Design an enzyme around this catalytic site. Structure first.
Site, PDB file in Angstrom:
ATOM      1  N   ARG A 278      -0.206  -4.839  -5.966  1.00 50.72           N
ATOM      2  CA  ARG A 278      -0.192  -6.143  -5.314  1.00 50.72           C
ATOM      3  C   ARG A 278      -1.283  -6.264  -4.266  1.00 50.72           C
ATOM      4  NH1 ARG A 278       4.460  -9.522  -5.977  1.00 50.72           N
ATOM      5  NH2 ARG A 278       3.614 -10.520  -4.116  1.00 50.72           N
TER       6      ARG A 278
ATOM      7  N   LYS B 112       0.810  -1.207   0.000  1.00 50.04           N
ATOM      8  CA  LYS B 112       0.000   0.000   0.000  1.00 50.04           C
ATOM      9  C   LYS B 112       0.848   1.265   0.000  1.00 50.04           C
ATOM     10  CE  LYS B 112      -4.176  -0.732  -1.031  1.00 50.04           C
ATOM     11  NZ  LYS B 112      -3.918   0.151  -2.195  1.00 50.04           N
TER      12      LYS B 112
ATOM     13  N   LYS C  45      -5.141   4.655 -19.251  1.00 49.68           N
ATOM     14  CA  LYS C  45      -4.987   3.254 -18.854  1.00 49.68           C
ATOM     15  C   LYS C  45      -6.335   2.771 -18.353  1.00 49.68           C
ATOM     16  CE  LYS C  45      -0.537   4.656 -18.990  1.00 49.68           C
ATOM     17  NZ  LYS C  45      -0.138   5.926 -19.634  1.00 49.68           N
TER      18      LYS C  45
ATOM     19  N   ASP D 238       8.923  -6.910   4.700  1.00 50.85           N
ATOM     20  CA  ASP D 238       8.329  -7.526   3.517  1.00 50.85           C
ATOM     21  C   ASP D 238       8.411  -6.518   2.390  1.00 50.85           C
ATOM     22  OD1 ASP D 238       6.642  -9.349   2.023  1.00 50.85           O
ATOM     23  OD2 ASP D 238       4.917  -8.149   2.586  1.00 50.85           O
TER      24      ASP D 238
ATOM     25  N   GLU E 255       7.148   4.682 -16.800  1.00 46.74           N
ATOM     26  CA  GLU E 255       7.123   5.514 -17.991  1.00 46.74           C
ATOM     27  C   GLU E 255       6.230   6.716 -17.752  1.00 46.74           C
ATOM     28  OE1 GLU E 255       5.709   2.163 -18.338  1.00 46.74           O
ATOM     29  OE2 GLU E 255       7.792   1.431 -18.270  1.00 46.74           O
TER      30      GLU E 255
ATOM     31  N   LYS F  65      -1.379   5.326 -12.647  1.00 46.56           N
ATOM     32  CA  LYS F  65      -1.822   5.313 -14.041  1.00 46.56           C
ATOM     33  C   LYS F  65      -2.795   6.450 -14.294  1.00 46.56           C
ATOM     34  CE  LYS F  65      -1.619   0.213 -14.300  1.00 46.56           C
ATOM     35  NZ  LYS F  65      -2.410  -0.975 -14.628  1.00 46.56           N
TER      36      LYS F  65
ATOM     37  N   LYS G 103      -2.640  -5.355   8.878  1.00 48.83           N
ATOM     38  CA  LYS G 103      -3.535  -6.156   8.045  1.00 48.83           C
ATOM     39  C   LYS G 103      -4.709  -6.585   8.910  1.00 48.83           C
ATOM     40  CE  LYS G 103      -1.812  -8.861   4.890  1.00 48.83           C
ATOM     41  NZ  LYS G 103      -1.079 -10.018   4.251  1.00 48.83           N
TER      42      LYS G 103
ATOM     43  N   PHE H  16       5.472  -8.643  16.074  1.00 49.58           N
ATOM     44  CA  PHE H  16       5.455  -7.889  14.811  1.00 49.58           C
ATOM     45  C   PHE H  16       6.115  -6.539  15.090  1.00 49.58           C
ATOM     46  CE2 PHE H  16       2.059  -6.665  11.324  1.00 49.58           C
ATOM     47  CZ  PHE H  16       3.016  -6.177  10.495  1.00 49.58           C
TER      48      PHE H  16
ATOM     49  N   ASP I 267      -7.283   0.013 -17.317  1.00 56.12           N
ATOM     50  CA  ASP I 267      -7.270  -0.762 -16.087  1.00 56.12           C
ATOM     51  C   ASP I 267      -7.889   0.015 -14.943  1.00 56.12           C
ATOM     52  OD1 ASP I 267      -6.032  -3.153 -16.870  1.00 56.12           O
ATOM     53  OD2 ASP I 267      -4.036  -2.412 -16.318  1.00 56.12           O
TER      54      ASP I 267
HETATM   55  C1  LIG Z   1       3.841 -12.032   6.479  1.00 54.94           C
HETATM   56  S1  LIG Z   1       4.624 -10.863   5.324  1.00 54.94           S
HETATM   57  C2  LIG Z   1       4.762 -11.980   3.823  1.00 54.94           C
HETATM   58  C3  LIG Z   1       5.784 -13.108   3.936  1.00 54.94           C
HETATM   59  C4  LIG Z   1       7.200 -12.548   3.938  1.00 54.94           C
HETATM   60  N1  LIG Z   1       7.523 -11.938   2.617  1.00 54.94           N
HETATM   61  C5  LIG Z   1       8.243 -13.578   4.355  1.00 54.94           C
HETATM   62  O1  LIG Z   1       9.424 -13.351   4.076  1.00 54.94           O
HETATM   63  O2  LIG Z   1       7.879 -14.606   4.956  1.00 54.94           O
HETATM   64  C6  LIG Z   1       3.184 -10.104   4.571  1.00 54.94           C
HETATM   65  C7  LIG Z   1       2.626  -8.933   5.363  1.00 54.94           C
HETATM   66  O3  LIG Z   1       2.259  -9.389   6.681  1.00 54.94           O
HETATM   67  C8  LIG Z   1       2.588  -8.392   7.621  1.00 54.94           C
HETATM   68  N2  LIG Z   1       3.659  -8.841   8.523  1.00 54.94           N
HETATM   69  C9  LIG Z   1       5.004  -8.618   8.454  1.00 54.94           C
HETATM   70  N3  LIG Z   1       5.636  -9.126   9.544  1.00 54.94           N
HETATM   71  C10 LIG Z   1       4.643  -9.672  10.314  1.00 54.94           C
HETATM   72  C11 LIG Z   1       4.690 -10.296  11.548  1.00 54.94           C
HETATM   73  N4  LIG Z   1       5.820 -10.497  12.226  1.00 54.94           N
HETATM   74  N5  LIG Z   1       3.520 -10.730  12.068  1.00 54.94           N
HETATM   75  C12 LIG Z   1       2.345 -10.531  11.391  1.00 54.94           C
HETATM   76  N6  LIG Z   1       2.265  -9.936  10.182  1.00 54.94           N
HETATM   77  C13 LIG Z   1       3.418  -9.507   9.694  1.00 54.94           C
HETATM   78  C14 LIG Z   1       3.011  -7.131   6.858  1.00 54.94           C
HETATM   79  O4  LIG Z   1       1.834  -6.386   6.593  1.00 54.94           O
HETATM   80  C15 LIG Z   1       3.551  -7.724   5.563  1.00 54.94           C
HETATM   81  O5  LIG Z   1       3.511  -6.828   4.491  1.00 54.94           O
HETATM   82  C1  LIG Z   2       0.580  -1.073 -23.320  1.00 54.41           C
HETATM   83  S1  LIG Z   2       1.876  -1.406 -22.084  1.00 54.41           S
HETATM   84  C2  LIG Z   2       1.104  -0.544 -20.608  1.00 54.41           C
HETATM   85  C3  LIG Z   2       1.067   0.980 -20.683  1.00 54.41           C
HETATM   86  C4  LIG Z   2       2.473   1.555 -20.577  1.00 54.41           C
HETATM   87  N1  LIG Z   2       3.040   1.303 -19.221  1.00 54.41           N
HETATM   88  C5  LIG Z   2       2.539   3.030 -20.950  1.00 54.41           C
HETATM   89  O1  LIG Z   2       3.528   3.676 -20.588  1.00 54.41           O
HETATM   90  O2  LIG Z   2       1.607   3.538 -21.602  1.00 54.41           O
HETATM   91  C6  LIG Z   2       1.315  -2.969 -21.408  1.00 54.41           C
HETATM   92  C7  LIG Z   2       1.774  -4.179 -22.204  1.00 54.41           C
HETATM   93  O3  LIG Z   2       1.282  -4.069 -23.555  1.00 54.41           O
HETATM   94  C8  LIG Z   2       2.269  -4.537 -24.444  1.00 54.41           C
HETATM   95  N2  LIG Z   2       2.790  -3.448 -25.286  1.00 54.41           N
HETATM   96  C9  LIG Z   2       3.907  -2.681 -25.122  1.00 54.41           C
HETATM   97  N3  LIG Z   2       4.083  -1.848 -26.181  1.00 54.41           N
HETATM   98  C10 LIG Z   2       3.042  -2.120 -27.028  1.00 54.41           C
HETATM   99  C11 LIG Z   2       2.726  -1.604 -28.273  1.00 54.41           C
HETATM  100  N4  LIG Z   2       3.445  -0.661 -28.880  1.00 54.41           N
HETATM  101  N5  LIG Z   2       1.619  -2.086 -28.881  1.00 54.41           N
HETATM  102  C12 LIG Z   2       0.865  -3.060 -28.278  1.00 54.41           C
HETATM  103  N6  LIG Z   2       1.140  -3.577 -27.061  1.00 54.41           N
HETATM  104  C13 LIG Z   2       2.233  -3.103 -26.487  1.00 54.41           C
HETATM  105  C14 LIG Z   2       3.395  -5.175 -23.622  1.00 54.41           C
HETATM  106  O4  LIG Z   2       3.046  -6.534 -23.415  1.00 54.41           O
HETATM  107  C15 LIG Z   2       3.289  -4.408 -22.310  1.00 54.41           C
HETATM  108  O5  LIG Z   2       3.809  -5.111 -21.220  1.00 54.41           O
HETATM  109 CL   LIG Z   3       0.826  -8.940   2.002  1.00 58.70          CL
END
Ligand SMILES: C[S@@+](CC[C@H](N)C(=O)[O-])C[C@H]1O[C@@H](n2cnc3c(N)ncnc32)[C@H](O)[C@@H]1O
Ligand SMILES: C[S@@+](CC[C@H](N)C(=O)[O-])C[C@H]1O[C@@H](n2cnc3c(N)ncnc32)[C@H](O)[C@@H]1O
Ligand SMILES: [Cl-]
Ligand SMILES: O=c1cc(Nc2cc[nH]n2)[nH]c2c(-c3ccccc3)c(-c3ccccc3)nn12
Ligand SMILES: O=c1cc(Nc2cc[nH]n2)[nH]c2c(-c3ccccc3)c(-c3ccccc3)nn12
Ligand SMILES: [Cl-]
EC number: 2.5.1.6
Lengths: 381, 381
Positions: A250, A18, A275, A244, A56, A271, A167, A236, A277
């Site tokens: 994500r 986040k 875009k 992490d 970009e 974005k 979380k 924690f 999305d």
């Molecule tokens: C548990 S970590 C993900 C696994 C981690 N990448 C690892 O190396 O195992 C995911 C999220 O859980 C939270 N987190 C981190 N440490 C933690 C802890 N000790 N206890 C509980 N949650 C935790 C944070 O929000 C973090 O971004």
């Molecule tokens: C369109 S790009 C996402 C937008 C981009 N980050 C930007 O700066 O506008 C997303 C994906 O579309 C594909 N892509 C990249 N260039 C492209 C192009 N010229 N025409 C069509 N698809 C493309 C690639 O797979 C890329 O990872």
């Molecule tokens: Cl997470």
């Protein structure tokens, strides 16, 4: 019989993924403040001591990335090495290039704004449910509000051992009701939050129940059987990017419907409106909410999809779960007559050049704050 | 009447997000080859000239990250500056730390393997549909196969202007059938693929229709009305990370069900089995597929959820869309009697210490290659 459990989660403002969403949208907003037509695709990565911007941007703005990034981290609350991260002293690295000229020529160069092409292919969904006034699933609403409560009590100093990374997770028992869903009770709550080295586990667990959960979740949903997992890891202290790695995009289910409805995979933060999305997902939410608030459905899912360079959606589909007297074909005709889902029209209807995006990047993009996509359109049919 | 459109997408091996997923899983596999109990949380970021690894690994393995990363990029096909990226000469940066000791103590330290806690909280879904033999939605199957065909024709030299970065999208017209879904025809296909500077647009569009689409999509689904968007941007010479930044875990819908079913938000790649985002999603797929292949349902969605440090799921839920004579309550009892969804048992049932993960990281994790989660369990009831 006819009941089921459903779980959603949310995360706090200092959760490392986040953090990245908020920084990406702080960068977007900074560009849009100076150049409403900025083309922005800013990804953020966070790990111990590091914010990296990658992506970009083509923009007439002059943006001080050091200042923008550090002010966003400051706002989140990471201001000292004792908390694991400090906006004053972290590394900010930048790997930003112009937008690909091949993309630009195929999407927007020499195009009338209303007829700009989608900035990518993809699929997007919008969802709305009458189970809450904000037309969102109760599971995700409650999960978000638990994180907001933690931030409130951190910032007001009444739980000063709290840190920004958190979380939450809420499981609700539901009853099905003619395609709609009716919440009955809260079955399980999880809360994990980063904390200082001094506070003990029992103090935290008591505060999380009495000052957090009871301040958020109506008592009518909590009973003797509700299960609480409060600081379930036991410790924690290490948290934020140090605990992490974080990346933009994500937390896309936290950002949307908590597992309800559907998702097409695209992330929102960092974005600009071209875009789809982001813009088409916002428009699809606006359609879904308009259908529910307009009394046509109790619950609805809308899919749209696009091809890069093509303005009109390739497909539009509606599913009402059986909660309308009208067929989905009829609802689709109503949507077609009332909405224009080209990105160059969505931008006008939803005011998507305005620099309000950092506000969307925590606590979900939907169900809050009367953003334009949350104000239903009055439908003609 | 009763018909609807539905769209899914897929991406190729050289799509920048997919590059990152594959590298993350190449790193995971390299660790697991030496230390089956490695704790791995490896994120990859890709931009022009750069692969960055960020995250947390605690492992007894000695891994040469330069070699692992570069060999993965070589396999994908980025081997020359003319293609926009070259495994021989790109920058590989590493920002990897040990797993947080606070996580380790709360999850797995001093725990019996079967009773290890979930590595995080979260929610996960599994889905299966009888509309294809592999129990996957036709939209996503076809989209994946179009990308695989592009890679085949690139690697065999018959379309030597192709480059590794591609995206595809398939819209199918479906009929609903007692809660199941029946594909009727393909309504729209999108294909965008990176290409060399010499080939012209008409040659590409003709080849994409005749040598790609017709080699993949049965003619019975294609008709005079099918819409084709082939190289819709008009020019895609710049591609790979140079055209668009990539990150691990940004193709989670491509990795799963193409918008069908549901998603809990967690990414798969770069994570060992203790991260339930992957292991529990694989187990949930295995449950769903077992229910469909066992003749109990035609279509089914399974949700599970976890709390960090707790071994058993906090919730398990099933929805059969009306495609079983048994109630969902009865199916849940069958699942409870036949499956143990603790991560420390899933690892045994699905052999999740085996270094097969790079193979999962393109063309979807499900519906392919008889991985353990794709071999139905015979159910006792
Ligand atoms: C548990 S970590 C993900 C696994 C981690 N990448 C690892 O190396 O195992 C995911 C999220 O859980 C939270 N987190 C981190 N440490 C933690 C802890 N000790 N206890 C509980 N949650 C935790 C944070 O929000 C973090 O971004
Ligand atoms: C369109 S790009 C996402 C937008 C981009 N980050 C930007 O700066 O506008 C997303 C994906 O579309 C594909 N892509 C990249 N260039 C492209 C192009 N010229 N025409 C069509 N698809 C493309 C690639 O797979 C890329 O990872
Ligand atoms: Cl997470
Ligand atoms: O409309 C209904 C009616 C219903 N009835 C019963 C009765 C016993 N179990 N289920 N269950 C559901 C589910 C669902 C329930 C549990 C697990 C997974 C999905 C969903 C759904 C939620 C999110 C995303 C997509 C679909 N919708 N939905
Ligand atoms: O079971 C049915 C029956 C059905 N009938 C009709 C009839 C006219 N429109 N829809 N439509 C659907 C949809 C769906 C259709 C279009 C848009 C969005 C969802 C889904 C679904 C797909 C993915 C994720 C979750 C749910 N399931 N589903
Ligand atoms: Cl993409």
């Amino acid at each position: 019989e006819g009941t089921f459990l459903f779980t959603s989660e949310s995360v706090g403002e200092g959760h490392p993924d986040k953090i990245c969403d908020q920084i990406s949208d702080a960068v977007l907003d900074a560009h849009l403040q100076q150049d409403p037509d900025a083309k922005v695709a800013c990804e953020t990565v966070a790990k111990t001591g590091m914010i990296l911007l990658a992506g970009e941007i083509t923009s007439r703005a002059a943006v001080d990335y050091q200042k923008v990034v550090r002010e966003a981290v400051k706002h989140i609350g990471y201001d000292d090495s004792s908390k694991g991260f400090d906006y004053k002293t972290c590394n900010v690295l930048v790997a930003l290039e112009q937008q690909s000229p091949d993309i630009a020529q195929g999407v927007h160069l020499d195009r009338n704004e209303e007829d700009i092409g989608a900035g990518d292919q993809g699929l997007m969904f919008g969802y709305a449910t009458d189970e809450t006034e904000e037309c969102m699933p109760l599971t995700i609403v409650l999960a978000h509000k638990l994180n907001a409560k933690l931030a409130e009590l951190r910032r007001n100093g009444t739980l000063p051992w709290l840190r920004p990374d958190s979380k939450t997770q809420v499981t609700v028992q539901y009853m099905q009701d003619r395609g709609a869903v009716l919440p009955i009770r809260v079955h399980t709550i999880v809360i994990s939050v980063q904390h200082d080295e001094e506070v003990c586990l029992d103090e935290m667990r008591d505060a999380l129940k009495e000052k957090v959960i009871k301040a958020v979740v109506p008592a009518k949903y909590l009973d003797e059987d509700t299960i609480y997992h409060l600081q379930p890891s036991g410790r924690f202290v290490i948290g934020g990017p140090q605990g992490d790695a974080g990346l933009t995009g994500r937390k896309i289910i936290v950002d949307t419907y908590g597992g309800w409805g559907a998702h097409g995979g695209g992330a929102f933060s960092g974005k600009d409106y071209t875009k789809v999305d982001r813009s088409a997902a916002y428009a699809a939410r606006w359609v879904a909410k308009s259908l529910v608030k307009g009394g046509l459905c109790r619950r609805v899912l809308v899919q749209v999809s696009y091809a890069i360079g093509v303005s009109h959606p390739l497909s539009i589909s509606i599913f009402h779960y059986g909660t309308s007297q009208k067929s989905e074909r009829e609802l689709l005709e109503i949507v077609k007559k009332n909405f224009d889902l080209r990105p160059g029209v969505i931008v006008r209807d939803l005011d998507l050049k305005k620099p309000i995006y950092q506000r969307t990047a925590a606590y979900g993009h939907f169900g809050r704050d009367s953003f334009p996509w949350e104000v239903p359109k009055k439908l003609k049919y």
